[PDB]
Design a protein around this ligand. Structure first.
Ligand SMILES: Cc1nc2ccccn2c1-c1ccnc(Nc2ccc(OC[C@@H](O)CN(C)C)cc2)n1
Length: 287
């Protein structure tokens, strides 16, 4: 910390504040997250989890009842880009590029048995070249996903997999594919797919769109800890209605990313092979 010149506050994460900084000795420009504090061991392991579509974790500094995470610096987050693109939309080829790259990042982490578990537009970071990277990979497993952040902000439920909401204790890499599918839809329509404002509102929003799950589509669902037989039974909607602009390859991939049964939900690796990415390219974003 005596080693970093703080440049400016860039924001507030789930666990702590984030600063743009300059290493006072190497002159490296970084993003510095400061967390007011097994977690150290696990976080420290993430330094080897390196991929072009994962935000580089340069260093972990544990001193004085604080845990500092030193990240490579990216230009901005995807949420801000989506917000600035509200009136016109992010062009389809760029959406497809970002999804392709994000899936590469998931496939890498999942191959090493590391899940994110709390993906959302805010922790997807982009640069001016056309790249997109996943941040905060592995921090959920180390700290848990709390109800409120360190600043008492509500942690969003919009991207939470149904198996998590139904109280499953052992989630799989499928939870990240769900979240990523919800973000995909949001980029395409310029509205959140499932903007729930409580756990049951989140669940019932999913159900009104995808249909109330049963034993036919999801074996074991009725025996999950928070399943109630009294859940209203809603009919499944046609995807044609859910994400309309989107062509059939797009809808096919999204429907497979939103399968109820985690065991049937498409893997990141299988998703990369999907015909939607036949014509994928790497456009430069208009920021
Ligand atoms: C890892 C990480 N966590 C967070 C949490 C909040 C904000 C940033 N981060 C990062 C992080 C890591 C690497 N690079 C970046 N870049 C970055 C830069 C500027 C950003 O925007 C701030 C302004 O656009 C808006 N401001 C007025 C609120 C956001 C992210 N963020």
């Amino acid at each position: 910390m005596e080693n970093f010149q703080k440049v400016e506050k860039i924001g507030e994460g789930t666990y702590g504040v984030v600063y743009k900084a300059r290493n006072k000795l190497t002159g490296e420009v970084v993003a510095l997250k400061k967390i007011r504090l097994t977690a150290i061991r696990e976080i420290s392991l993430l330094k080897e989890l390196n991929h072009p579509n994962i935000v580089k974790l340069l260093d972990v500094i544990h001193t004085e009842n604080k845990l500092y995470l030193v990240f490579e610096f990216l230009h901005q987050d995807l949420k801000k880009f989506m917000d600035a693109s509200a009136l016109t939309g992010i062009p389809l080829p760029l959406i497809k590029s970002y999804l392709f790259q994000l899936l590469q990042g998931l496939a890498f982490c999942h191959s090493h048995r590391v899940l994110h578990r709390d993906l959302k537009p805010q922790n997807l970071l982009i640069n001016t070249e056309g790249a997109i990277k996943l941040a905060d990979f592995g921090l959920a497993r180390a700290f848990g996903v709390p109800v409120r952040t360190y600043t008492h902000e509500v942690v969003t439920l919009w991207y939470r997999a149904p198996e998590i909401l139904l109280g499953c204790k052992y989630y799989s890499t499928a939870v990240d594919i769900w979240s990523l599918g919800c973000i995909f839809a949001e980029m395409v329509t310029r509205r959140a797919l499932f903007p729930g404002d409580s756990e049951i509102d989140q669940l019932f929003r999913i159900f009104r769109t995808l249909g109330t799950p049963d034993e036919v589509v999801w074996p074991g669902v009725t025996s999950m800890p928070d399943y109630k037989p009294s859940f209203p039974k809603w009919a499944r909607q046609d995807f044609s209605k859910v994400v309309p602009p989107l062509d059939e390859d797009g809808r096919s991939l999204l429907s497979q990313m939103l399968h109820y049964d985690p065991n049937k939900r498409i893997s990141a690796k299988a998703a990369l092979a999907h015909p939607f990415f036949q014509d994928v390219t790497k456009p430069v974003p208009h920021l």
